[PDB]
Design a protein around this ligand. Structure first.
Ligand SMILES: Nc1nc2c(ncn2[C@@H]2O[C@H](COP(=O)(O)OP(=O)(O)O)[C@@H](O)[C@H]2O)c(=O)[nH]1
Ligand SMILES: Nc1nc2c(ncn2[C@@H]2O[C@H](COP(=O)(O)OP(=O)(O)O)[C@@H](O)[C@H]2O)c(=O)[nH]1
Lengths: 680, 680
């Protein structure tokens, strides 16, 4: 019958959730199989040394169960975020919320809240929670005049609720505002870079506010994020026409409005040169959608804008993000399958050969193994000569940037009009409650300048890793050759892209983490954790610069202030000096403080590349070492126990079948789910 | 036929405009008549000494032509003020205005703008003016984060336009915002106290904002002003109901909303104990009214809320303010008529008596005249012993208040969170561009505290003048008796409230100024000019207190600041001192600065009562002196010229008729206009 798109969403979601689950199943089965066989190893012809795969496959499975689509819902004050969500999840839940709220599936309506001032994760009931954590439009505009946070004792609150949408694997993060303090919090907790998509609610009666346009630039622009812009309260446009019942006039006003959003959002709706504006921007009437879902949740929403929007989001999540993520699981399973497969194909034959003939064959390949180690060294160098070059060139960029900011300060000092909270200043006394006060006053300035640079930084670190990838690809290709030989000189018989395993990780085609510190958006969930780590330290930098230029000018200021309240200095006499002193002190230290500060940025860029090196290293040594033990364990047995060669044959032939069997089920689940899409 | 209320308004207005005009006519005629006769005086039996009446009557007339109803239209950002006005005056004039705009009748669409930075009153065309003086919702919220004024080089702009409403005698003052800077400007230019009514546009989607509620308290509460609250965009309430087409549900939401406005506005809709809330608060849909007036200006507005509102405003203006004002003109005319009448009735008879018999009769009353001077002295004392007592008790009140504000400063310092504009601070250097910066930061605090006290001050000055009035009443009563005798002992034949003239002014029953410095709201237009003069000096006071406590603490601060940026003082070491110093200095000067400041408030209260004394004096001496010259001029002639006693008789009998004739026409115009209302 009339299949509403709200059904299609729940359907697809459910479907995926099944593929996800079924793979999880095979993955364990696969792990359990490689594992049992490996334990039997010592009591037989020795282990095959497949522990790295067991582990990897095990994490992969555990990841698959905890799988979920995270959506970050951003939006300014009173735009409809609340009503919007209710409409989306078909309930009148949120109150038509002054604190980051994570909405997730749960059996009972519960609400636990995590603090930051120390307090251990409390607990409450939505009934009381709704009253304890909210703000009247009055005392909320008040905590706005000072750009302060509502409850800084809270990091975020979680809300479990029986909502079928959340059941099928959806988590919602509802951000309370666009201000900068709340911004960092979200950035620091991950979110902005730990969610599959961003839902940025806007309103037709307030087209791309300065507040919005600013946020977009400081936190979204060129950061490679998927964000759908929902122009809410679209229905209001017509309640202002000469004739609110003239589709032609209406259309014309809507058009006036539409060229405004396009002008400001086009820039954010493109993917690799291709423009997808109308698959990301949606004119909506949340109030009309909600109303309809209140008379019947299986209600058709055509006319509210929702359908068109939901189908895009459905597609993105279930036919793109799921595929990519699922595909990786297949890749990991094929790796496990092959390593096992080949390992066995190498052993069975060596089982017949005698200890002497064996060590002769093993020594035969010693030169090949060392070559592998040549790659492990040749690539490690390059890896490090890249961190060094990068951690240098960037530190330079920052140092140079901070300094040069001083050449424009005057003009900027005017554009931004730092407001100093006189109460915050005096109030306490800690050499922090006084510096924070000044730090706040320069919040917008710090954020802006700060966000701009890290964009530039990231654009480079990206390319770096993009090269290292291409590099690993080739080293991987040769590594394989050297590997093929080790098999031939051992066995006698010479046996997606099929590069080695460690190569798969180094290229960012695979990964067990949702995110990583390189530009690998095809790895894991794709999440860019270097926007966190980077655009956080940089703030400490550009802020320290202030925290520094602060202690630099206090003295000169205090002098002027003091030399006036006593009468030693007259009006405008101290100002021809405060300056004389300022300029003097700055040109006397700024360059040093810049340099001193650009040393934190150094450690951050060095870190990015040290994580990568640390991992790629593990995996490569891990390969080398296992292939070698593969051979050593045999000898350790031929000289110690006595194996029944034919029973070993079945046991290992069995191992091989059982694993492949599992891989196929997975390969199927994937193919089927894909094919289903071929016909829909 | 279907007479729309927009017609009734234009009608009534027109009608009044006629009565007003006709009286103006008779007034001149009356003045011209007393004048011609007076010139003939020297060549005849001498002047009657009616110059005070000629003058008074002449001003009264000139005032009558320049007559107009002034409306102050207040309102927050984006509430509908603009759309509202357009709907009111049936045009799509204002742009759906970042500067006080005075909208008045004019032949050609013109726009002159008066500055304050010096520039001489420029000039423009609405075409260009519309573009040169406006602000995008963007760069307008920007000049909001710092609570600054858009164009401080402008005081206001006037806009002449061919609008029949303005023709019939209506002026509109459209205020751009509720902020405090714009507030003072309006207060300083008069407006808030130089307009017959205030139109405070509010919006249903933003019920009594903090911004609004604050304004109301600081500028309207207990100030005796007439303000109509227009709850605009009332239509929007239903676009949020489960079912927007359920009058019952609607009504219930409206009710939820209605108890909010009543709770906050009731307080402002009462007159002498009587509550008239629903004659002042009006739920409106400006957008629907405008639309209808675009298809036809003679359009019925029933259903928009406008009709109900307009009729109240019509009533207030044309059947209350006009009456009161017109009635005064009648009072002034009766005074002129009587003074003339009686003067003549005293002379004709003395014309027969011979010089000797005359001086005998004149000397006969010398004791009576001195008695009159006894009143002129007995009342002048009291007048002055009242200014002294008041200018003292108030100065005390202020001094005491300023000091005591210090006992609560800490708590207040928290409530208000003074933001200091770091740019403004440093920037220049004048011992003003630095103090202003600090003055601004404390704007809200100064305004609030300041406005509160002057309310208290006014409540007293009122009573003072209310007493002086009652006092004058009685002195007037006796003055009359003494006057009656002077006539009897002279003539032989013993000849609204009918107190003497000077008594009429002292009681505030009459006045040639729209406003005055006493609580006389029955005098002139009623305007309270002591809310201007008073609530302006007080700001200079509570602000100077700051400007003072500023220079008091600079030194201690500068010391702490300086003793930190050099390392002589550690963190939280200087703060146990900044305080040590603060408290020390304040308790060491505040009391003196308070006292020094409470000396401006002294001059303001002394002024109020000196204006009153100055005037009441003039009028009383003026009476005494004329009545005396009345007698002297006769003698000056009986001894110098020779008059034809019978011709003088006709000339003066004529004078008498001609004046009375004019008074009657006026007495009629008034009575008729009133009676017309008796039947409508
Ligand atoms: N006409 C219309 N009004 C809306 C729409 N969405 C929300 N509103 C109105 O805005 C109010 C709710 O704002 P809200 O959702 O709480 O803002 P939020 O808390 O920032 O998400 C309600 O009273 C609605 O009347 C919409 O799509 N169309
Ligand atoms: N629904 C509704 N909208 C209104 C009403 N009055 C004004 N508006 C809307 O508010 C906007 C105009 O705001 P405006 O009058 O310029 O605010 P102002 O400049 O502060 O007076 C228009 O786009 C209208 O759609 C009203 O009575 N009802």
């Amino acid at each position: 019958v009339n299949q509403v798109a709200t059904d299609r969403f729940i359907q697809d979601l459910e479907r995926v959730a099944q593929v996800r689950s079924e793979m999880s199943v095979c993955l364990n089965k696969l792990a359990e199989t490689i594992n049992k066989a490996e334990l039997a190893g010592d009591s037989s012809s020795g282990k095959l040394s497949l522990e790295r795969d067991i582990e990897d496959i095990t994490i992969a499975s555990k990841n698959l169960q905890q799988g979920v689509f995270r959506l970050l819902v951003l939006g300014d004050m009173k735009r409809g975020k609340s009503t919007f969500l209710n409409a989306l999840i078909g309930e009148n839940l949120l109150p038509s919320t002054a604190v980051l709220t994570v909405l997730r599936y749960g059996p009972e309506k519960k609400v636990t809240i995590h603090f930051n001032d120390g307090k251990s994760p409390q607990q409450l009931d939505f009934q009381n929670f709704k009253y304890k954590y909210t703000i009247d439009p009055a005392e909320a505009k008040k905590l706005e005049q000072e750009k302060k946070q509502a409850f800084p004792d809270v990091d975020y609150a979680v809300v479990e609720y029986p909502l079928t949408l959340l059941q099928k694997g959806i988590e919602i993060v509802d951000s309370p505002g666009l201000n900068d303090t709340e911004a960092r919090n979200e950035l620091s907790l991950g979110y902005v870079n730990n969610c599959h998509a961003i839902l940025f609610v806007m309103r037709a009666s307030q087209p791309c506010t300065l507040g919005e346009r600013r946020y977009l630039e400081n936190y979204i622009k060129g950061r490679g994020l998927t964000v759908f812009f929902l122009v809410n309260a679209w229905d209001q446009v017509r309640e202002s026409l000469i004739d609110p019942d003239d589709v032609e006039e209406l259309q014309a006003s809507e058009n006036r409005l539409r060229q405004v959003f396009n002008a400001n959002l086009a820039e954010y709706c493109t993917v690799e040169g291709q423009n997808i504006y109308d698959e990301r921007v949606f004119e909506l009437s949340s109030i009309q959608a909600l109303r309809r879902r209140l008379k019947n949740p299986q209600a058709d929403l055509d006319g509210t804008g929702f359908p068109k929007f939901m189908d895009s989001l459905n597609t993105f999540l279930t036919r793109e993000r799921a595929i990519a993520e699922l595909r990786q699981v297949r890749t990991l399973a094929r790796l496990a399958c092959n390593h096992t497969r080949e390992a066995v194909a190498r052993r069975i034959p060596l089982l017949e050969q005698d200890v002497n003939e064996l060590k002769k064959r093993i020594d035969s390949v010693e030169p090949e193994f060392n070559k592998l180690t040549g790659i492990r060294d040749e690539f490690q160098k390059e890896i490090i000569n890249t961190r060094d070059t990068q951690a240098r060139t960037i530190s330079e960029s920052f140092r140079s940037y901070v300094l040069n900011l001083g050449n424009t300060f005057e003009n900027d000092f005017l554009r931004y009009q730092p407001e100093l909270n006189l109460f915050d200043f005096l109030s306490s006394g800690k050499r922090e409650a006084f510096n924070a006060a000044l730090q706040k006053a320069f919040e917008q300035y710090i954020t802006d300048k700060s966000a701009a640079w890290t964009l530039t930084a990231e654009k480079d670190i990206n390319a770096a890793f993009k090269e290292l990838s291409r590099s690993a690809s080739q080293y991987g290709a040769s590594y394989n050759q050297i590997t093929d030989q080790i098999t031939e000189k051992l066995t006698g018989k010479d046996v997606e892209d099929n590069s080695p395993g460690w190569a798969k990780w180094a290229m960012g085609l695979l990964s067990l983490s949702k995110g990583n510190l390189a530009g690998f958006a095809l790895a894991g969930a794709g999440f860019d954790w270097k926007n966190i780590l980077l655009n956080y330290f940089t703030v400490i930098g550009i802020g320290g610069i202030i925290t520094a230029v602060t202690g630099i000018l206090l003295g000169p200021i205090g002098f002027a202030l003091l030399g006036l309240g006593v009468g030693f200095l007259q009006a405008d006499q101290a100002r021809r000096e405060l300056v004389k002193t300022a300029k003097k002190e700055l040109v006397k230290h700024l360059p040093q403080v810049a340099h001193e500060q650009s040393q934190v940025v150094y450690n951050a860029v060095k870190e990015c590349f040290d994580s990568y090196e640390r991992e790629v290293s593990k995996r490569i040594n891990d390969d080398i070492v296992s292939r070698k033990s593969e051979l050593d364990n045999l000898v350790k047995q031929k000289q110690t126990r006595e194996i029944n060669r034919e029973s070993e044959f079945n046991r290992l032939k069995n191992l091989q079948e059982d694993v492949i069997a599992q891989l196929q089920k997975i390969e199927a689940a994937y193919s089927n789910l894909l094919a289903y899409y071929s016909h829909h």
